[PDB]
């Protein structure tokens, strides 16, 4: 039970659900941990990605899929680094590295994740992520080069 | 006084010192509010710029005035935003953009700056930004 657990605790249990989510993640499942209104929001603006409600994030999933394979994701927080937990404000940040093999390739970069959770702290309402502008660039790239469905 | 604050508000003070430090920045005054053995981190890694000490902070400080004039330097909260301070961790993150006006052009970028104290919260031990390395990359190249 995740109300046993102390808040600073629950904080980091419920935005790591996320990742274990992207890990374990099947359509027939869909997006598990978030409130109703849960947000993505991708940083910096600069990059253009607009906020994304939980089925718009599944329609992100849903259209990769036709085009692309995707195998392997994994996510481990950098080695050394701790979670960075305001109970008060309800927010976890992690310092963060993702793994995927996509298509033919490695998909791989680091990143910085904000989550915030429901007043309970039990699930996330919020998950923004800032992102290796210079290598999601590319990745876009790369996959405009791409024929759809490999 | 800063032990007469709160610990989250002095966490916060003391982080916040790093940018009005930035916009005040006098060559002759230096970088206040910091521990001797601070460490600036530049994230991600991929950007490739090394961790650097007070000192060789300074000496880039020292090598971009002889390359181009800076000026008006301005730095702020992502509107709707508010610092995230972990109090148990001296810990403090800030959603930022910074301006400044160099060779007539205007810098302007957003980042995310992790700040860590001392244990008593009154000086910065750590400072670390992820930045925008497309931006970032494009604005190294074009100097
Ligand atoms: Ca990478
Ligand atoms: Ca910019």
């Known amino acids: 039970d995740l109300m046993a657990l102390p808040l600073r605790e629950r904080l980091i249990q419920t935005a790591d659900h996320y990742f274990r989510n992207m890990e374990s993640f ?3 499942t869909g997006l598990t941990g978030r409130t109703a209104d ?3 929001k991708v940083l910096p603006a600069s990059f253009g990605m607009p906020d994304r409600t939980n089925e718009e ?4 999933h849903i ?3 036709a085009d692309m394979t995707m195998k392997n994701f994994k996510a481990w927080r950098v080695p050394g ?3 960075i937990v305001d109970e008060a404000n309800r927010k976890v940040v992690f310092h963060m590295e993702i793994y995927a093999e996509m298509g033919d390739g490695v ?3 680091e990143f910085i994740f904000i989550m915030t959770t429901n007043d309970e702290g039990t699930l996330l309402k919020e998950v923004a992520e800032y992102v290796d502008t210079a ?9 405009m080069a791409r024929t759809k469905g490999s």
């Not at 290598?135 to 996959?143: L, N, S, V």
């Open 26 to 28: 099947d359509l027939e």
């Open 38 to 40: 849960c947000i993505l």
């Open 57 to 60: 994030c599944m329609a992100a």
């Open 63 to 65: 259209a990769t899929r």
């Open 81 to 83: 680094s701790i979670p």
């Open 107 to 109: 998909y791989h970069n």
């Open 135 to 143: 290598a999601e660039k590319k990745f876009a790239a790369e996959r």
